[model samples]
Target: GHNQVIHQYFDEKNTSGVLVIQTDKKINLYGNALSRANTEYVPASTFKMLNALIGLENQKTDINEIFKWKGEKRSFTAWEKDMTLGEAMKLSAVPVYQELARRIGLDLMQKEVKRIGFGNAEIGQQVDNFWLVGPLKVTPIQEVEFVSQLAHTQLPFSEKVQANVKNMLLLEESNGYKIFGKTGWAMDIKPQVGWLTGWVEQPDGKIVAFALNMEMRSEMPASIRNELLMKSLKQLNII
Candidate 1:
């Protein structure tokens, strides 16, 4: 019923996005979000959730601890100062988490990355910049697998790691469902990529994991990425 409305939500330009939704008992898919399920694209900030897990699992940093910012500006002004794990996630602060990723290092992340089956799992020659600009990349299907594991406590990590990461993913509570997710934006190429991946847990005990991404214009506003995903979620009636 909502297909047309959802179809209209996508800009008819060069945009190609997909949404894969999975519940315990069923898998509902929408849009053209599946053509490249096997293709690994730059995960950008979406790796933060994965980053947070490694940071905690390896005992690098705790989620509640405050991380002092470097006063360096990258993309947003919200990233100019200190932040907790919770705050960094809210602001989508890249540098703060980048520092955390640096703290994790490649030696620790290499095996952990493979264990989670996160994309190519290649940290490249440099440890700090792999996921952003180096060799690491992940696919939408793989993203669904990773998040589903996180949501179900199926990952081989401590309970605290799961708890803290889950808490950090909370986007909001809406329409009887708590929507917890992360937004990823990458401008490594001309057709920029954006991702909104996470799971929704409903009071009725129905939980669905989703991984959605789209190719958008470089000139398109950054906010459109997540907005594109959200409007599709409404059409699917999964929120």
Candidate 2:
């Protein structure tokens, strides 16, 4: 069973996490999914998916608009230049989206957030910092729900808006499948949380949506999330 595969991975890694996969016929959960998967945490960069949609819907940003880096030294050299929304997403650059959030503003952000039925749907007082810090939170299960809808263009946002964000999420295509996803790190809390949430589109057009969250500690290598993700998908024959 998946629980066995999940347990073995957790035990071997000496860490804890949750993985939730949703297909057309059923949902598969592993590693304390009932508890941890439902538990909410700050979404961090994963919110950029929705952020892109909102910014586009409001005409606050364009898919090809180049956001200048202002010459600020970024943690990554890849983020040190002007780039488009897609480029920012590929690098998970924080400043570009932060600017987009501010442009979306409070009232409209609150409206669109509630309208879409996101987890908790709370953007709080500060428009730019809520998802990164406190007041905005979502569960791995909710992450799956949101991305699944986006994958199908079923969300309240316009089809073009949804489609654009989906295009930016494309990570790769191989083995007769295409994978679209986003990774997030909520660094403000104790032990933090690492996230990988998105979906896989098989050549037949079937979608397998997934969300994985794990405790991030100083001792854990940064690659652990991707490693565990590969293992989890294997157990489900997703990859």
lDDT by residue for model 1 over 171-206, one digit each (tens)? 878678888888887877646778889988887967
Q: What clash pairs does model 1 have? A: 18-33
Write the residue-wise lDDT of candidate 2 on 144-175 in tens digits: 98998889898888998899999999987998
For this target, which candidate reaches the highest lDDT against the unseen true structure? 2
Worst 10 residues of 2 by lDDT: 25-34
**What's the true lDDT of residue 235 in model 2?**
76
Worst 10 residues of 1 by lDDT: 25-34
lDDT of each: 0.78, 0.86
TM-score of each: 0.91, 0.95
* Candidate 1 lDDT for residue 155: 81
